[PDB]
RNA sequence: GGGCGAGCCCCGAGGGGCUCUCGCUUCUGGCGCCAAGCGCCCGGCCGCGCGCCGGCCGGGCGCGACCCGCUCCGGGGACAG
RNA sequence: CGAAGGGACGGGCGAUGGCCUCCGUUGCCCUCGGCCGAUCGAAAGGGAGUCGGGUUCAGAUCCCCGAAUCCGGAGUGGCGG
């Protein structure tokens, strides 16, 4: 299926397609709060490999952590 | 104003949008008296205060 | 009297039967009548001299 | 008569220092909330930055009038609806022993909706036409599929909105729509739309994949640059020419 | 056609519903543990309180600490069907509350005090 | 657009291109908001009856208050940090 | 670095309540709207309105007697002017 390509696309983080996406997302999440709920996963295949299933009750959050 | 060596001039403007009088805290120039009209803007003329 | 005693006082005891009564001294209220009137007459004077400027030039 | 001379005009002068301002529209200067302000300038960042052609390819969307016939032909092939699975299941339930039938005959062709279903049958050359929604808010789900359908020779089209693409299926969103099989009388109707899509997406593929987008400044800034261009033109166009 | 008159965005007045519980939280309401018998403990046989009876036309009681002048007035009405002009309370320096209930002049204090049992 | 506008050139003294100026406030310790007017529609009562006819009562919309846009305006900005 | 109002006048729709004539109740819609932010913080700061006499072994501007005064309510307005 498409889950294999999404995995291997995300491994080319230095590639210019991913640098545009990482730039837009990190700009977007910086304007939000330090802790808020996300409705759907940004990375679906990575969530499923760690045990996330798209059914009722599976909740995800997003937390900003200071660098250093 | 206590703790300050300069007097303050209480200038009241009318808000050009909604019907109220707006009170300001202007530092008084030397020569400012009560009831003197004080202008504020780009087209205002050139005098003290 | 104390300001919270003003509730039980009558209307005529709290003001004076006049325009701007009970909150404006009689010296300055009649001066505002003759202040506002002379501006309105001067504004008529200015707009007449403004009107001749439109017609002549 | 009808008129009465007690009706004067008494107009209001809306000047500076004159009579007070009226209640005019102020939509430009509303202090919008954080979520409204974020998403409004987020679309601006999609016009400021140099978006890559793999993402810029979803700005070139199929035009208006051809999208109607794509949906009209897909309207008769939509997946079947809740309680009509049970209508289909119950109708074939009596037929086991009512009229001497095991129901082995045929399942009518339908569309495909998920990305995992479409990509499996595009690699295996079982697809004839792929419809792709452009407004998926992870774009990473569908980026290779425009590129993958070109090599496999499967025609691919980009459509406005996952909502109306999610209306062909009986759900909210649907990123991908792939035609595997159609009926005989609709094969000629599908074929006239296949060649029109190939000449826009597949045949000119070299143009899209090196087509960067963005680099469009604001109208307040573009007009300032355009003011400098016409001022430079005004300075030296008549001295020599 | 709808314009934004104010430059400040304000949260719209959304509709909120009331409570339609599918089951009461507590099974039954609690019974009143401050009834007309738990509010009047016992009167006083003090000669200082005795002198107050035929002179001031009053009665003296020990009253529960969580009481109220409205409830004490209604309590003596409920028990011994006597009307009250005013009720007067204090808290003694021993933990409890004492009440000086004043009767209306149409009844006699020492006549009803014999019905109480105190004399 | 609009004009008292400073005017020039062409000019038929109606008027078109060019630089700039305002969306029309400086003499006085007064007032100023919750629109006038215009235009187009709607409902009820009465009389003409051919009714977009007239009278009364009660409402809506647009101009008045130009149109379109993508950052609220500015000041920095690849440096600050 | 904030979608920080749950309030109010008038009108329209519908309903119940008491002699659904009238008044009253609540839900929605149109409309208006800020004010600088929850809250706590003085028994010497602000803060409406009680005094005289008598009375107890020990309390009295607090109890009794006699004179007032302030606040809130009133639908049918309880009466007059």
From Swiss-Prot, chain A:
Modified residues (Phosphoserine): 33
Localization annotation: Cytoplasm
Highest taxon listed in the record's lineage: Eukaryota
Lipid anchor positions (N-myristoyl glycine): 1
Subunit field text: Component of the large ribosomal subunit. Interacts with IFIT1 (via TPR repeats 1-4).
Role of this protein: Component of the large ribosomal subunit. The ribosome is a large ribonucleoprotein complex responsible for the synthesis of proteins in the cell.
Similarity comment text for this entry: Belongs to the eukaryotic ribosomal protein eL15 family.
Name of the protein in its database record: Large ribosomal subunit protein eL15
Organism in which the protein naturally occurs: Oryctolagus cuniculus
Gene name per UniProt: RPL15
Shown part of the complete sequence: 2 to 69 of 204
From Swiss-Prot, chain C:
Record's keyword terms, sorted: Acetylation, Cytoplasm, Endoplasmic reticulum, Isopeptide bond, Phosphoprotein, Ribonucleoprotein, Ribosomal protein, Ubl conjugation
Chief place where the protein resides: cytoplasm
Organism superkingdom: Eukaryota
The keyword Ribonucleoprotein is assigned to this record: yes
GO biological process, one term: translation
MF-aspect GO terms: structural constituent of ribosome
Cross-link Glycyl lysine isopeptide (Lys-Gly) (interchain with G-Cter in SUMO2) residue location(s): 50
Keyword Ubl conjugation on entry: yes
A GO CC annotation given for this chain: ribosome
Subcellular location: Cytoplasm, Cytosol; Cytoplasm; Endoplasmic reticulum
Family indicated by similarity: Belongs to the eukaryotic ribosomal protein eL34 family.
Function: Component of the large ribosomal subunit. The ribosome is a large ribonucleoprotein complex responsible for the synthesis of proteins in the cell.
Self-association state and partner proteins as the record states: Component of the large ribosomal subunit.
Official protein name in the record: Large ribosomal subunit protein eL34
């Amino acid at each position: 299926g498409a889950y294999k390509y999404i995995q291997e696309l995300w491994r080319k983080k230095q590639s210019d397609v991913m640098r545009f996406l990482l730039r837009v997302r990190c700009w977007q999440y910086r304007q939000l709060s330090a802790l808020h709920r996300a409705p759907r996963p940004t990375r679906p295949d990575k969530a499923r490999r760690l045990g996330y299933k798209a059914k009722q009750g599976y909740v995800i959050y997003r937390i900003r952590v200071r660098r250093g | 104003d206590p703790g300050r060596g300069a007097p303050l001039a209480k200038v009241v403007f009318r808000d050009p949008y909604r019907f109220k009088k707006r009170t300001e805290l202007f530092i008084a120039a030397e020569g400012i008296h009560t009831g003197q009209f004080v202008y504020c803007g780009k087209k205002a003329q050139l005098n003290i205060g | 009297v104390r300001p919270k005693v003003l509730m039980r006082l009558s209307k005529t005891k709290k003001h004076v039967s006049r325009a701007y009564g009970g909150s404006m001294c009689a010296k300055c209220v009649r001066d505002r009548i003759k202040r506002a009137f002379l501006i309105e007459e001067q504004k008529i004077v200015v707009k007449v001299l403004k009107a001749q400027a439109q017609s002549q030039k | 008569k009808v008129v009465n001379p007690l009706f004067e005009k008494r107009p209001k002068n809306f000047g500076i220092g004159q009579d007070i301002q009226p209640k005019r529209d102020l939509t430009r200067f509303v202090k919008w909330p954080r979520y409204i302000r974020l998403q409004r300038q987020r679309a601006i960042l999609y016009k400021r930055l140099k978006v890559p052609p793999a993402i810029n390819q979803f700005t070139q969307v199929l035009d208006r009038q051809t999208a109607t016939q794509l949906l009209k032909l897909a309207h008769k092939y939509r997946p079947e609806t809740k309680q009509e699975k049970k209508q289909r299941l119950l109708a074939r339930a009596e037929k086991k022993a009512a009229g001497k039938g095991d129901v082995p005959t045929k399942r009518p062709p339908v569309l495909r909706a998920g990305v995992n279903t479409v990509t499996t049958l595009v690699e295996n050359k079982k697809a004839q036409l792929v419809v792709i929604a452009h407004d998926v808010d992870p774009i990473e789900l569908v980026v290779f599929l425009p590129a993958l359908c070109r090599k496999m020779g499967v025609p691919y089209c980009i459509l406005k909105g996952k909502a109306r693409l999610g209306r062909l299926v009986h759900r909210k969103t649907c990123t991908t729509v792939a035609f595997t099989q159609v009926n005989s009388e609709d094969k000629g109707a599908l074929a006239k739309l296949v060649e029109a899509i190939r000449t826009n997406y597949n045949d000119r593929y070299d143009e899209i994949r090196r087509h960067w987008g963005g680099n469009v400044l604001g109208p307040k800034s573009v007009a300032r640059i355009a003011k400098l261009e016409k001022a430079k033109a005004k300075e030296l166009a008549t001295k020599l020419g | 056609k709808k314009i934004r008159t104010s430059p400040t965005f304000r949260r719209p007045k959304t509709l909120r519903l009331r409570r339609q519980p599918k089951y009461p939280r507590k099974s039954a309401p609690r019974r009143n543990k401050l009834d007309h018998y738990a509010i009047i403990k016992f009167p006083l046989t003090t000669e200082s309180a005795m002198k107050k009876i035929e002179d001031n036309n009053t009665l003296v009681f020990i009253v529960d600490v969580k009481a109220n002048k409205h409830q004490i007035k209604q309590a003596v009405k409920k028990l011994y069907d006597i009307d009250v002009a005013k009720v007067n309370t204090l808290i003694r320096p021993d933990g409890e509350k004492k009440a000086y209930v004043r009767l209306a002049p149409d009844y006699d204090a020492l006549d009803v005090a014999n019905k109480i049992g105190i004399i």
